[PDB]
Design a protein around this ligand. Structure first.
Ligand SMILES: Cc1nn(C)cc1C(=O)Nc1nc2ccccc2[nH]1
Length: 215
């Protein structure tokens, strides 16, 4: 794998979003992954619908949590790989209560055919990320509410509770870091992003790494 990758620079990552008071980071992690993969497959960068997942993926628990891998399985097995646009299935869960599932009225903006799980190895994850793009990972975000900037070096790494998106890394820096897209608006962290140290399993970043497959 190359020394440093940033898929934001390649135009592969959509704007930072806001999950609100909903426990739907799993859906932002999953949708954000799909968005990137969709683009990297030659299709236009498209905003896709977390609310689609929150309302309809009954394999997960809407505003009360879920798993990226479930979402990936749900999209393929229950929705024919279909992922609707953000515009046509906009987010309505900011106050923590999701509207129920709807089918009509939404426009299919992307398709996936499955997913892969990555090993619990940061070198291997970086290897995959270098070739195939942004990875969906679960982390411990307990120590994240007070992050301002810089590279988090001793993140509380005790229990996974939050889904995010690895959009890149940098092994050349003084403290090697992952670049992570979060869903807590752009006011948080570094314009909605956080850099955590790479190699010491900060926040348990490597425990649940996976990615949708497009085409
Ligand atoms: C369960 C679960 N598993 N995974 C991978 C993520 C979750 C989850 O509920 N995350 C989540 N809830 C939040 C509530 C408020 C702000 C941010 C929040 N993030």
């Amino acid at each position: 794998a190359p020394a440093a990758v940033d898929w934001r620079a390649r135009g592969a990552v959509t704007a930072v979003k806001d999950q609100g008071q909903c426990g739907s980071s799993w859906a932002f992690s999953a949708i954000g992954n799909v968005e990137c993969q969709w683009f990297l497959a030659g299709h236009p960068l498209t905003n896709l619908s977390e609310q689609m997942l929150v309302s309809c993926d009954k394999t997960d628990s809407g505003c009360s949590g879920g798993l990226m891998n479930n979402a990936f399985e749900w999209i393929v097995q229950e929705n024919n790989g279909a992922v609707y646009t953000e515009d046509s299935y906009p987010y309505a869960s900011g106050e923590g209560i999701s509207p129920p599932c709807t089918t009509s009225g939404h426009t299919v903006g992307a398709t996936i055919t499955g997913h892969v799980e990555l090993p619990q190895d940061e070198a291997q994850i970086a290897a995959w990320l270098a070739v195939n793009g942004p990875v969906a990972v679960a982390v411990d975000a307990s120590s994240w509410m007070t992050y301002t900037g810089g590279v988090m070096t001793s993140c509380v790494s005790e229990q996974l509770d939050h889904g995010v998106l690895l959009v890149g890394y940098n092994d050349s820096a003084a403290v090697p870091y992952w670049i992570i897209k979060n869903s807590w608006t752009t006011q948080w962290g570094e314009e909605g992003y956080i850099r955590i140290a790479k190699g010491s399993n900060q926040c348990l970043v490597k425990e649940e790494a996976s990615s949708a497959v497009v085409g």
